[PDB]
Amino acid sequence: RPRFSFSIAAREGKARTGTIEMKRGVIRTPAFMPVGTAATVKALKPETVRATGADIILGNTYHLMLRPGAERIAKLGGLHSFMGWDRPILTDSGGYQTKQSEEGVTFKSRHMLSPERSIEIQHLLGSDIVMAFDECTPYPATPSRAASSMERSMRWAKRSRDAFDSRKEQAENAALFGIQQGSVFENLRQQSADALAEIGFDGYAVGGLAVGEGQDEMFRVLDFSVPMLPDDKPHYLMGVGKPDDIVGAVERGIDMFDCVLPTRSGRNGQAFTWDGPINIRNARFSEDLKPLDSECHCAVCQKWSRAYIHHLIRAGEILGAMLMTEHNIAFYQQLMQKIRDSISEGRFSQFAQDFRARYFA
Amino acid sequence: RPRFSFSIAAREGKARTGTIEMKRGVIRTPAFMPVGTAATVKALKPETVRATGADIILGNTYHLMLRPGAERIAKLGGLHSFMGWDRPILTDSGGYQTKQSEEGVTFKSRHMLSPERSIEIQHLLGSDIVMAFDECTPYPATPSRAASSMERSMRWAKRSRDAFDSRKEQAENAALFGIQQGSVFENLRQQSADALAEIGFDGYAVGGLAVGEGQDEMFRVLDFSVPMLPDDKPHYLMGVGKPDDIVGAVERGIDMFDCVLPTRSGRNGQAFTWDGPINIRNARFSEDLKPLDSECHCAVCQKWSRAYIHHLIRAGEILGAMLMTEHNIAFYQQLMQKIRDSISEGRFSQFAQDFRARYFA
Ligand SMILES: Cc1nc2cc3nc(N)[nH]c(=O)c3cc2[nH]1
Ligand SMILES: Cc1nc2cc3nc(N)[nH]c(=O)c3cc2[nH]1
Ligand SMILES: [Zn+2]
Numbered sequence: 197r198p199r200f201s202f203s204i205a206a207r208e209g210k211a212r213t214g215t216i217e218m219k220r221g222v223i224r225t226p227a228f229m230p231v232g233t234a235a236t237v238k239a240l241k242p243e244t245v246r247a248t249g250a251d252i253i254l255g256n257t258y259h260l261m262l263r264p265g266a267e268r269i270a271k272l273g274g275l276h277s278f279m280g281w282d283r284p285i286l287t288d289s290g291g292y293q294t295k296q297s298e299e300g301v302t303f304k305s306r307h308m309l310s311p312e313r314s315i316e317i318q319h320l321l322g323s324d325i326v327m328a329f330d331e332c333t334p335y336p337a338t339p340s341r342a343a344s345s346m347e348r349s350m351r352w353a354k355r356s357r358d359a360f361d362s363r364k365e366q367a368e369n370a371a372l373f374g375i376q377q378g379s380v381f382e383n384l385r386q387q388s389a390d391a392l393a394e395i396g397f398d399g400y401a402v403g404g405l406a407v408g409e410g411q412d413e414m415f416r417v418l419d420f421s422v423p424m425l426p427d428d429k430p431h432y433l434m435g436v437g438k439p440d441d442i443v444g445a446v447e448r449g450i451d452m453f454d455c456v457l458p459t460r461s462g463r464n465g466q467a468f469t470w471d472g473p474i475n476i477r478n479a480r481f482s483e484d485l486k487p488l489d490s491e492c493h494c495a496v497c498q499k500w501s502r503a504y505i506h507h508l509i510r511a512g513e514i515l516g517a518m519l520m521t522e523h524n525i526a527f528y529q530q531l532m533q534k535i536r537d538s539i540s541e542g543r544f545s546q547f548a549q550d551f552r553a554r555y556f557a
Numbered sequence: 558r559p560r561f562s563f564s565i566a567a568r569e570g571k572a573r574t575g576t577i578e579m580k581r582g583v584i585r586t587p588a589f590m591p592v593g594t595a596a597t598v599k600a601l602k603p604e605t606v607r608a609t610g611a612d613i614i615l616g617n618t619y620h621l622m623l624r625p626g627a628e629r630i631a632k633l634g635g636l637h638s639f640m641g642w643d644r645p646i647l648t649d650s651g652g653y654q655t656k657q658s659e660e661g662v663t664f665k666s667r668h669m670l671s672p673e674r675s676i677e678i679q680h681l682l683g684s685d686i687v688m689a690f691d692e693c694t695p696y697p698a699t700p701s702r703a704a705s706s707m708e709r710s711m712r713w714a715k716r717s718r719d720a721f722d723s724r725k726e727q728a729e730n731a732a733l734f735g736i737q738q739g740s741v742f743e744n745l746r747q748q749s750a751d752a753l754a755e756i757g758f759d760g761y762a763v764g765g766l767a768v769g770e771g772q773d774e775m776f777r778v779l780d781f782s783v784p785m786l787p788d789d790k791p792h793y794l795m796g797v798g799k800p801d802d803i804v805g806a807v808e809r810g811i812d813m814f815d816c817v818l819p820t821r822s823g824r825n826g827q828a829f830t831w832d833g834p835i836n837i838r839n840a841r842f843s844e845d846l847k848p849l850d851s852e853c854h855c856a857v858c859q860k861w862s863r864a865y866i867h868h869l870i871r872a873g874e875i876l877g878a879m880l881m882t883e884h885n886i887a888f889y890q891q892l893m894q895k896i897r898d899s900i901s902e903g904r905f906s907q908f909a910q911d912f913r914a915r916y917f918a
């Protein structure tokens with residue numbers, strides 16, 4: 197396989213479906229990435245993550261640098277070996293997680309991150325898709341502060357590029373994505389886009405969203421923001437999101453996604469279904485022999501009832517967290533597959549309308 | 558298969574190896590039963606429990622009556638269906654877990670257990686091996702109190718027998734075990750044995766042990782206690798125990814075992830190895846690429862390092878509990894297989910000596 201190759205196989209409006217080829221495997225787009233911030237997708241074995249259909253998982257520079265240590269993981273053979281996932285891994289750079297200066301950020305032991313240190317940690321982890329070190333701009337932000345923050349992030353983007361490129365092994369076997377900032381402001385988003393494209397990356401993330409602005413506002417920004425990015429490279433919406441966020445985002449040109457919701461909300465009792473989420477702890481499920489969802493093909497829905505999973509979660513049993521998470525990740529992957537197939541078949545717009553009609557009914 | 562058939566295939570001294578045939582499957586003896594007190598073997602899917610080699614698991618009347626409810630589980634199709642384990646299940650009767658009288662015991666909602674109610678709950682759960690409702694005598698016990706308690710338990714034994722037999726479906730498809738009491742006193746143990754044999758059961762448990770008396774004292778009581786039981790029926794030592802307890806107990810004639818140690822101690826960081834237990838949280842394991850145990854054939858030892866599992870447990874990750882438990886249950890099942898094979902081959906005494914020499918070195 198090449199280091200990195202993104203190919204678009206079919207389009208409908210702004211939506212795209214295709215593949216990213218990397219040395220460690222292929223990634224079908226639009227893609228959902230399960231989050232595994234401490235070198236584990238919570239409550240799942242990697243083989244289970246894979247069985248659900250995930251092509252790639254996300255790791256986090258910040259968390260792994262604190263525990264178990266980036267150098268430690270390198271010494272042990274890298275993150276893939278350590279956690280037993282041999283397919284691509286994307287690592288966030290820490291920019292979402294202090295003493296701040298133009299040089300970087302110190303967290304308090306006390307810990308330092310910068311473009312250089314972030315990129316190095318990602319190299320020590322052995323990540324396949326490396327994210328530029330940025331500042332995710334808090335929301336709401338005044339235009340001045342959004343601009344200052346965006347500007348610093350673009351300088352940090354160039355520093356991330358150069359650090360990555362200065363490491364032969366990394367530059368030859370991994371990919372590097374830039375992150376667009378600019379808050380909700382079109383001109384800032386354009387300036388950031390231009391800056392990133394001038395540097396040049398393998399992929400472009402839309403950063404700074406999902407941090408309190410609401411879906412209508414998020415979609416609005418995506419409306420003008422994604423067309424600013426190079427069309428021929430993947431578009432990644434960081435940390436998004438609920439099933440309906442994902443559908444709308446793909447409608448606006450997004451190709452990649454990650455979110456803690458399927459895992460986190462699973463362990464707390466929320467199960468995604470095609471009729472909308474349910475909280476399995478609700479007394480109405482105590483004697484419901486139906487599976488979590490009526491159509492889901494996952495192993496959990498093949499074998500156990502709502503009633504059982506209800507008992508498990510109420511009892512605080514670990515099996516409840518395992519089953520809830522396997523289902524929700526599988527659900528998310530089935531959503532992604534339905535999106536890919538519908539775009540490939542030229543009926544994605546219909547799919548999204550039908551989806552919304554049922555999910556919200 | 559028959560309702561119940563125990564056959565002994567080979568003996569060495571007091572040790573026996575053979576099989577219990579039941580409608581839901583065969584149980585190889587000497588047997589270790591993983592404990593699953595809230596309708597789950599903690600942190601394992603039933604298919605995983607089975608993959609480790611377990612033939613049967615234990616459930617608990619007391620816990621299941623409180624949560625989720627015995628009647629509820631019957632309404633939902635029984636415990637096998639509910640939790641997805643289709644092989645035999647043994648249920649303890651509640652006698653180890655108040656207002657006490659000759660009639661039974663009230664716990665505080667407020668909850669009542671008696672021979673009749675206990676047996677009925679076990680029927681509602683659909684258990685395959687039903688345990689008589691008893692009183693586990695606290696240790697230490699004076700001879701008078703041990704006798705009074707033992708005597709009450711024998712009366713309760715007859716009541717358990719009659720309740721079981723009064724339920725056609727139960728009597729035809731499940732088995733019933735009596736429990737010997739008598740604390741540490743030979744004459745009381747003999748009297749209890751005689752009483753149980755006079756009633757007649759499919760199996761005989763040694764109760765009242767592992768409740769603080771120490772291995773030397775436990776073995777001493779087993780020395781005279783197990784020969785008192787009918788030789789041609791299984792001998793079950795309730796709640797025992799560590800690997801070395803199990804070896805010594807088989808040397809004294811015990812055929813069946815259950816204990817929370819492999820699961821509980823797993824989630825707390827203790828891993829069983831042929832060189833003795835280790836606590837994986839210990840800093841000395843932080844960069845140890847070796848599997849938990851050097852010979853273990855389990856999937857965990859095939860795929861992950863001590864270092865990784867160390868990280869998981871220290872991080873409080875659910876995967877750490879899952880992997881620790883799978884290994885420890887598999888370890889326990891490999892121990893049972895080595896015991897069965899060595900008795901079958903007439904070299905069990907050598908096996909136990911070699912075992913002790915390494916486990917304690
Ligand atoms: C929900 C959400 N998660 C996010 C993660 C992010 N990471 C980076 N590096 N940069 C970001 O801007 C960023 C934004 C996010 N929003
Ligand atoms: C460690 C241990 N677990 C036990 C469970 C028991 N259950 C019953 N019914 N009766 C018992 O005597 C009994 C004794 C036990 N010892
Ligand atoms: Zn499902």
Ligand SMILES: [Zn+2]
Nearest residue numbers: 853855858884
């Ligand atoms: Zn193992």
